Structure 1
C-alpha cells in the first residue's frame, strides 16, 4: 500500500463542531457535553452552576439511585438549596461563549 490525502478534523472541522473540538482539548466544556461533578454542597462549598444568563434550571438527584430528579431555577445571587436535600447551588457566569 502507501500514500496520503484525506483532511483531518484539526484542519477541516468548522462551526460548532470545531468549537467543541478545541474547547475540549483546552479541558473546558462550554457546550455541556459532559456531566458536572458535585462539590460538598455545603454553604461554603456550593455547586457552581455556570450560566449564560441570570437563572438556570437545576436538577438535583438528591440520593444516588433516586428515580426522581428535583427541578428548580437557580438565580443569580445568594446560593440557593435543593428543596428536598438542602445542597447549595450558586450561579456563575458561563465562560466560553463563541
Structure 2
C-alpha cells in the first residue's frame, strides 16, 4: 500500500506557482501563459487587449505563417489598427486585482 506522507501542490504550492495553479482552476490567465484567440478584428468587434497600465505592446501576425510580426504600442482610448493589415485592437486597462 501507499502510506501517503507526500504533500500535494494543493497543500504546499506557494507564491506565483500557487497563484498560477488557482487562476488555471477558474479558467483564468492573469500571467499570460496562453495565446489569446483573435476576434474578427472589425471596428465593431475589436481584439480586446487587457493591461495593468494605459498602454501595451501588440504584435500582429497579420496572416497565418507570416514570419514578420508587426509591433506597436496600443494606448487606452479609441481602437487602433495594425499598420500592416488594419485589424482593430482596443486596450481594456484594469487594476492588478485578486
Gaps of 5+ in 2: none
Query: CA shift at 1:95, angstroms?
Result: 6.3
**Would the aligned equivalents of 1:51 and 1:92 in 2 still touch at CA under 8 Å?**
yes
Q: TM-score, normalised by structure 2?
A: 0.95
Figure out how many residues of one structure are paired with residues of the other and give that number.
98
Q: TM-score, normalised by structure 1?
A: 0.95
Asked if 1 retains the 8 angstrom alpha-carbon contact of 2:52 and 2:96, the reply is no
Take 1:96 and 1:40, find their aligned partners in 2: how far apart are those partners?
A: 28
| 4+ residue runs over 3 A deviation | 94-98
Q: 1:3 Cα shift?
A: 1.4
Gaps of 5+ in 1: none
Measure, in 1, the Cα distance between the counterparts of 2:67 and 2:59: 12
Aligned with 1:40: secondary structure? Answer: coil
Asked if 1 retains the 8 angstrom alpha-carbon contact of 2:54 and 2:75, the reply is yes
1:20-79 alpha-carbon deviations (Å, 9 max, x no partner):
110011011000000001000000000000000000000000010100000000000000
Change beyond 3 A, Cα 1:3–1:96: farther
How big is the shift at 1:93?
2.1
